Symmetry: C8
Subunit: 232 residues, 8 copies
Amino acid sequence: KWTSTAIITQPDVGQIAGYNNAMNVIYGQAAPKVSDLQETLIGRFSSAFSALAETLDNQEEPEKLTIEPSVLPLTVSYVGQTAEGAQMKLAQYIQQVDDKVNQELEKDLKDNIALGRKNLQDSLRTQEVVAQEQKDLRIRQIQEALQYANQAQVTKPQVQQTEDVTQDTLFLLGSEALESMIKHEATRPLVFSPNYYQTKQTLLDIKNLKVTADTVHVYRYVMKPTLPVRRD
Amino acid sequence: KWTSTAIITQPDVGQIAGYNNAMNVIYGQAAPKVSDLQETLIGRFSSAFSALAETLDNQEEPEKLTIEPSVLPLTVSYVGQTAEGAQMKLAQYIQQVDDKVNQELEKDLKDNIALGRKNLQDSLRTQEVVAQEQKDLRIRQIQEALQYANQAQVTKPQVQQTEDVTQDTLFLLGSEALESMIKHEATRPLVFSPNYYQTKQTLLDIKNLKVTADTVHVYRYVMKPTLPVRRDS
Amino acid sequence: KWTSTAIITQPDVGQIAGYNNAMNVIYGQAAPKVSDLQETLIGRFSSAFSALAETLDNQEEPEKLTIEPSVLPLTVSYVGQTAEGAQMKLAQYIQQVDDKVNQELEKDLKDNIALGRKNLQDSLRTQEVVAQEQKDLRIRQIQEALQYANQAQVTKPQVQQTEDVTQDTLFLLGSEALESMIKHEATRPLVFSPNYYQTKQTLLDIKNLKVTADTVHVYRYVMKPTLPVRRD
Amino acid sequence: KWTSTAIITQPDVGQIAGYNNAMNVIYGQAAPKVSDLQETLIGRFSSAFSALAETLDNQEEPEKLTIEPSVLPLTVSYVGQTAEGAQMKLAQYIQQVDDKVNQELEKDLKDNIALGRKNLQDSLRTQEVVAQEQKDLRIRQIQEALQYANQAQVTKPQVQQTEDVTQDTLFLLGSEALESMIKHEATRPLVFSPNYYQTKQTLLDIKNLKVTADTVHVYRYVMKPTLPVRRDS
Amino acid sequence: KWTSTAIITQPDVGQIAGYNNAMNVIYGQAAPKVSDLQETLIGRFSSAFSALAETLDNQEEPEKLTIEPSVLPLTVSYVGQTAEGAQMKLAQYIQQVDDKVNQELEKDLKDNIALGRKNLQDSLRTQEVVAQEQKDLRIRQIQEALQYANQAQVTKPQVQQTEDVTQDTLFLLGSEALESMIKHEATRPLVFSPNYYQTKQTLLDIKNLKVTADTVHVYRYVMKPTLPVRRD
Amino acid sequence: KWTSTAIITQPDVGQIAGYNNAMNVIYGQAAPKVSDLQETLIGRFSSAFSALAETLDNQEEPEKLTIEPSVLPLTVSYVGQTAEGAQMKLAQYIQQVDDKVNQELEKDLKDNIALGRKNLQDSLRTQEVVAQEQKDLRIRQIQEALQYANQAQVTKPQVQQTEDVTQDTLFLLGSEALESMIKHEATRPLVFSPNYYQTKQTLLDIKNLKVTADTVHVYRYVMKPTLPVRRDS
Amino acid sequence: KWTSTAIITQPDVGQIAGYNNAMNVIYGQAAPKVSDLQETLIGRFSSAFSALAETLDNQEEPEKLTIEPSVLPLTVSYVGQTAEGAQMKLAQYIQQVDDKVNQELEKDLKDNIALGRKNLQDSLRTQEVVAQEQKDLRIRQIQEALQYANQAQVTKPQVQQTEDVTQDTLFLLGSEALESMIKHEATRPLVFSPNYYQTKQTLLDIKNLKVTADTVHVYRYVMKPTLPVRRD
Amino acid sequence: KWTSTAIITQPDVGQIAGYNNAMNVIYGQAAPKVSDLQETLIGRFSSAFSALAETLDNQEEPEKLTIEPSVLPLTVSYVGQTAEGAQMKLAQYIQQVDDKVNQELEKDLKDNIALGRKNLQDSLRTQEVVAQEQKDLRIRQIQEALQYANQAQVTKPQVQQTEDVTQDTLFLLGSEALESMIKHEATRPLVFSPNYYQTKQTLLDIKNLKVTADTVHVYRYVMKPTLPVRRDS
């Protein structure tokens, strides 16, 4: 005959900043908005908590632990034999559910990150295969221009303006430069796209993410466990 | 006699990162949002499980197996003959369902991959057919410009400004170069668009997809099956 | 007194990939999202199934076939005289409804494709009429520039830079080249737009679509027909 | 005495591909989505059918004809004097309604086509009126540049860079060319925008529309009319 | 004791094409979609019809005219003394309500058009005031360049490339051409924007709109008035 | 004794074309959609009318005046002492309300116009303040380029390509021209953006707005007040 | 036994123009649409009014003041001892609530403005720090080009075309001009972006906002206080 | 004995201008809309207050403190022993809650600021790592062009057109310049994108954020606590 009671709610954004941020480095636009994130944390603690209460009943001698909307804050309650009491125990549990929910979120996050990392590396790899194809096409275009250059007898550059050169205009660079570009084909750097660099960027941000105990939080107190005055 | 319980919910986003990715490599923006994916996953377990509860009843000696919303998470249960027995058999049935649905999802994914790959490879040859028509036409404009270059007796290049030429300014390359471009038409490479490379990209990522027993998950435990301390009723 | 029972649901995306894809080659952006596609298949089998059950009642001696939400999977049931039994028969029917629904979807699809094909060819044709008009305008512009060229006595090109030429600048190409462009008017290729090539692209994809038995599926088992132990 | 039944639903997307296309050639993005089109189609049959049930009652000797949601598909029915008779007459009434509504839709489509074509052809002449004003103004800028070219005594072209000229750089073409451009103003072609060609395109496709008995469909059978084995009540 | 009955619904799109089109020439993007247009026509006839029925009751001897959803087609009904009868009369009324609703829609439309026309003309006028300001700024810029030209002693054009000239680059045209542009300031055409030409376009389309009896329609028959067999 | 009735609804889109336009000249995309405008209009009559029904009751000898949804259109009514009397007085009250609300809307519109005009004129001077800062800076870059042109002894223009210059290429105009541009800085015109002209445009159209008794309307008759043939009860 | 009654509603847009406008100068796109603004004013007066009525009850002798939807106009009512009476008093109160609601809105607005002003000034300041970094990068690029210029022995400009110069092309300006640009580094104006000028623009509009009694309004009469004829 | 009342609602937009701004400096478009912010603010007071009502009851001698929707505004109340006493204590409790929640919001904001700042600074070094790779590659293209320039014996610049060069036209700068660009590669500055400057911008504004007792507010009074004239019941 001694109930201790506390009131909990969604974690604050500052307390979740780093998680939200990590969810952004990994998912970019896809990452959840922060409010949905919060609603998902508390809601996950709630679930683990009821389950604990069910685990609590299934004992040689059952203990009584409650969870239900404060009306949307939530209200939890433990029934004790002494005043403080139902406290300590309640406190001891909030902390427990907190811990099992964290450990699990952190492990999931880290799994997330490693898979991202691995998918990013692969994106980089396949993107290079494409860029490599583009260079190869370029060398072919140059090989063709060399034929137009020789036949038009253009050996030295005829073009007095920078800009892009295209298949029909490469010959203006003249046979001497075009031969050099073919001879040195192997050492022509690949040209990588903006999307390629984004991939790298993200891969750098991902590798940087550090998961610690301060990373995620699941709930915040609006009232810590109470020491009840009037038993039952 | 004895009832075991467990509580169960959608798989975590880390648990299905691979599945999620695969759907994206294949579907692009059309891929499902990941929360929809989780929900679809558990619902597909939750249905197979109700379908198991059924078979266990269409039994010489029925067995009682139940699935229902905890409070959405699910509270699941089994009636055993002993404590351990209820615990064990629920665990076995949950893993039996888990297993069945996994093998369905993996098989259905690899099928999806195989078909994507085919549609992609076809997309490429159809695109090359167009790239080829564009090259063909380009050859045609050149042959014409050759005519204007002859009639104006422009033999050598009369421009000093790189910047792709057009049907009307091609003759400025002069008739020697243009003659050459027509002689070696057969060896002139097709120009492909960014879309053509998007396709090649997607095919390479489709091919690189590797489906394993980790790719897909269908549930997570809130509470593993309990060994109840007390018999029933 | 012997009921056999099975549980069915929407076909999986992999089993429908080729259909969805064909719906995309034909409709492009307009094609249904895949989920709506699935919800439409099962729902079409359901309808044919009830109808079968109605057909089943209308007999000298009626047979009993049921269809109703499993709660959204669906549940079907046949009443037999023997155990296996109501099975076989049930099985024999699922397969039947499956077949009538396929045959019909495939025929519709193929009709779809042929009409597309025919509308695409027509799009190509009319687009050429426009492109042809554009070329004709071009030749007129050239005919005019020839007058400005003759009168300004510009016979050889005055322009030392590639780029586009416009009506007011064509004369810079000089009367000799402009006369050539008029003389060879008939053999001036038409310039086709990006939209024109898209039309071709699609027409190529359409012609490629192959409809086979693996193309569409209407449902998937979550429980195949049961052999009932306890008659009624 | 005897009741025939049939179940009926919206036409398939392949069955109305032509109708759908027509609406697009005419309406563009404004065209209806195709699923909305199917639903509109059956609903227009389903209404004409209830309107038939009515007339059949306002009869010296009423006839009972019914339409109602199957379970949306529709379950339809007729009360005959014999088995075959109920089957036959339901079939006839369904085809009578089918027919009526078809002839309405085709007539309404051709009317739509005819009007589009008119609005398009008008759109073209109004656009040409503007194209003409733009040419007129262009002629005006040229006449002015002629003045600057005279006063600066630029007779021949002083530029080597193609790239459309402007009010302020036109004089660089020199006074001979500009004099010529003003002398042959009457024969200078209008420049038309892409929008002007979009219009021409749409008109050609409007004209190419060919309405036949295949273009439109209003229903599909789930179940053809039944010859009931058993009399009523 | 003789009721005649008919069933009406929204007018078809082909029958409303010209109205919808006019609503587009006047309102452009703002014009209602066609379906909302239809729902608005029928609904307007409905209203005038009930009102007529109310007008019908208010007589030395009242007549009975009904309007109510057929279940969304609508159903109307007249009560006669003879068979055909309640027809004719019913028919005579449908036609009446039709007429009062048309006459009113057509008058509104024409009012619409004239105001548009007048607002368009005004748009053209004020847009010219702006364009006129732009030209005036241009002449000032030229007046300034003339000073830089004189002082740098640039009398003949120094620029060998078409393109735009800006305030800092006009002097390259040389003092002789710049003086000419100032001397002929008054006859320098205004440069009008794309938006200006759109205004004209619309004003041309508006002036073209012709309102006739075929322009709008309010309803279509799904069943014309019936001649009742079994009085009451 | 006697009751007159009339049915009434939102004004037509042609009736308020002017009001609609005004809201657009003032508000742009923010203007209300026109169907919302109609609904707002009648609702503002419909409220003023219920407020009249009230005063007519707070009367030494009350009068009964009612407003209610017809079946949304409105069915309105008045209880007279004679037939004509009910008809007349309802008509008068409807026109009295019409009048009141009109004078409110017109006054509120002109107030809106007056304020727009002020905000616009202010927007212009604030923008000119920025245009001026941009010119000032431009003058600054020129003075600097003058330095590079002196130190490199570029006196005359060394470019042949029109195409606005930049801080780094300005010296290419040469020191004579740049010296001149700094000497006549005071007389160099500001360059204004398209936004600055959008503003000027909007102000000219705001000014050109002319509010009259035609601009706004608040209702349309489905049915004018009736002279009832029969007395009450 | 004498009730006086009035009917109020949302203020008109013209009466709120200046407020709405100020909310736009401060919030730009974020500012509320005008309708939501109106719904918020009236609704704020309503609240202050009920509260007044509650304040009215809490007296040695209570007065009775009502507020409730007219059905969405609102209806207020005061109970008097004489006819005019409950008027005056009612009138005296409407005016009071009006005043307390204004004074508060105006003070909030002005607070708003001053904070904006201060955040804008800060935006300008930090944006300059960035622009300053950009200039510094520019000077470095020039310092490098000077090395390429000296070594290629390019002392006088080699480029005969305006346009942008980049790191690889600055040397074409020649060592003499590049040395000048370094020597005069300190007096090189910063280049400010369009966003920078927007900030200034807004800061100019903000400073201009003038809050007066005509700025905000909270309600409009649809019926001013009545002088009741038939006491209770 | 005695009951005090007060009515309370969300803070004004001017009262939280600073908080609002802070969320924007940190969150961009992701920041919450300001009306959502107000509502979140009062709700967080309104909850802490119900949590106070609780503690005041878990008391040796309970105290009655209530919160409920006024009619959304809130009507709040306290039961005192005297008039003044109820007024005073309600005021104290409202300020006690106000205080608690303020210190939570400020602490949570500064935490947010601190973390932003860290993520930003990291974003910068990761970006520099890429900028560096782009420079590295640029150096690579130059070394190659040096080869083409040697083999074609282009020693001095052969172009007169500013306009960034590319892998294929770099040799036109000639081998002396290119040799120089490779010799001083170590001292060549990285080019940073606009995104890199957006980041720097955001960091400077994050740093400039100054949290004080004015930044955040959680409620506004419609009606301050009343000294009731009359005792209870």
